[PDB]
Ligand binder design. Structure first.
Ligand SMILES: C[S@@+](CC[C@H](N)C(=O)[O-])C[C@H]1O[C@@H](n2cnc3c(N)ncnc32)[C@H](O)[C@@H]1O
Ligand SMILES: [Zn+2]
Ligand SMILES: [Zn+2]
Ligand SMILES: [Zn+2]
Length: 428
């Protein structure tokens, strides 16, 4: 694809570089999804085939668990829908495959249907994906085996499975190159595989941002890219300090980042901000809170699957109180709990609580992320839609206009999401 090229990136394997300049907001390229799945919770909200968010969604009369825009989207999805239609109804409540198993089954399907290079593989092919097979611990290798067992159990009707456990190779490849599709509010819509998009290496200070216009991945410049510069995306959440960022990257992607931010650690001091207070906190007292903060984060990750919403908020308020003694309110570990608490109030349809948390987050949040960040665009959007809901038309408009500003860069001026937000301002 024009104005870019695949190249050998010293110490980063294969990569994508520019052959022409790209300005802030310019679309480098699009990539139609090679394989994709609409997440189970978004059924009836989005079209299974084109991911269009609409209300007049017609049901699959054969499974009553697949929705479409019309009969053509339904017919166009049947080669992929075939995999789950009858099994969902025949397996009944016993039908529980994870999204990774759902996705991998559609990759195997695509490889049988269309074995030749797809328009999504102009620079990187699915077969050429990096696996990191050789660095997997037994715990990880066992987690892939669960997924393989699950593949065989639910998708054996139409699929012929490959040469021993070269399914381990494929499952390690989808873990390494697999994409999750999120909406305007960064809510999970599904999983997909974008091969050319997967060629891009990581930077904690990227020059590009991946957005989705249905099942189509779009790459837009968030910094100026000049000929010969490598195009880098972020694989992870850029709020956390160097250690946390690299702890996630090493775990999920088996590499350590050495970008300007991870080298310099410049933004680290501000990220884990400490209170100025009479008799400043001791060097060890700081390290003790970081360990607590990082453990309460994981404890919360578990607690959501098995605790009441009023219990979840209690975890948030209690942990914020312990942390507040050492940590300032701008600290990323404090801002996470506030983000968690806002999420709960939103679930409980507590629009005041959600707004009080948003307002408390946004200013310090904006500061901690790059200039064009999907996290802060989404946060400004949540805040705007909350204000607008609570009939605060002035503040709601400021917030929605702030979101539109970041969004016109990453998503593009003509994005369906921008047109939706503009209508929210125009009516109320
Ligand atoms: C989605 S693939 C990117 C394309 C990959 N470089 C290739 O040749 O197939 C992700 C993998 O690329 C490598 N990678 C990406 N960004 C990197 C970086 N900044 N430093 C080192 N390795 C990186 C890691 O091995 C990582 O798991
Ligand atoms: Zn459709
Ligand atoms: Zn069906
Ligand atoms: Zn980095």
């Amino acid at each position: 694809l024009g104005g870019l090229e695949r190249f050998c990136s010293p110490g980063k394997g294969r990569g994508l570089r520019a052959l022409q300049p790209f300005q802030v907001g310019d679309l480098l390229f699009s990539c139609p999804a090679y394989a994709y799945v609409l997440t189970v919770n978004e059924r009836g909200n989005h079209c299974e085939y084109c991911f269009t968010r609409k209300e007049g969604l017609s049901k699959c009369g054969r499974c009553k668990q697949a929705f479409y825009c019309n009969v053509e989207c339904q017919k166009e999805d049947w080669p992929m829908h075939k995999l789950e239609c009858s099994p969902m109804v025949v397996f009944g409540e016993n039908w529980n495959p994870s999204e990774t198993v759902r996705l991998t089954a559609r990759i195997l399907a695509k490889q049988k249907i269309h074995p030749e290079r797809t328009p999504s593989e102009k620079l990187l092919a699915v077969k050429e994906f990096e696996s990191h097979l050789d660095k997997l611990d037994n715990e990880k290798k066992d987690l892939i085996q669960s997924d393989i067992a699950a593949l065989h159990h639910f998708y054996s009707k139409h699929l012929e499975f490959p040469d021993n456990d070269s399914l381990v190779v494929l499952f390690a490849q989808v873990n390494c190159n697999g994409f999750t599709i999120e909406d305007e509010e960064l809510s999970h819509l599904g999983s997909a595989i974008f091969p050319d998009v997967a060629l891009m290496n990581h930077s904690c200070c990227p020059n590009v941002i991946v957005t989705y216009k249905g099942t189509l991945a779009e790459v837009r410049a968030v910094q100026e890219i000049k000929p010969g510069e490598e195009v880098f995306t972020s694989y992870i959440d850029l709020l956390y300090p160097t250690e946390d960022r690299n702890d996630r990257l090493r775990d999920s992607y088996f590499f350590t980042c050495e970008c300007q931010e991870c080298t310099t650690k410049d933004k680290d001091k501000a990220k884990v901000e400490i209170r100025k207070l009479s008799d400043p906190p001791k060097a060890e007292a700081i390290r003790d809170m970081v360990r607590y903060a990082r453990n309460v984060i994981e404890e919360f990750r578990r607690a959501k699957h098995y605790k009441s919403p009023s219990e979840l908020l209690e975890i948030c308020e209690l942990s914020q109180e312990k942390m507040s003694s050492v940590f300032e309110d701008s600290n990323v570990y404090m801002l996470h709990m506030m983000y968690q608490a806002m999420g709960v109030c939103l679930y409980m349809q507590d629009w005041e609580g959600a707004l009080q948390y948003g307002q408390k987050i946004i200013k310090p949040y904006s500061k901690h992320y790059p200039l064009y960040s999907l996290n802060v665009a989404s946060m400004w959007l949540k805040l705007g839609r909350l204000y607008m809901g609570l009939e605060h038309k002035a503040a709601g408009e400021k917030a929605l206009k702030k979101a539109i500003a970041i969004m016109e860069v990453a998503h593009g001026k003509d994005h369906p999401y921008i047109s939706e937000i503009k209508q929210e301002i125009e009516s109320h």
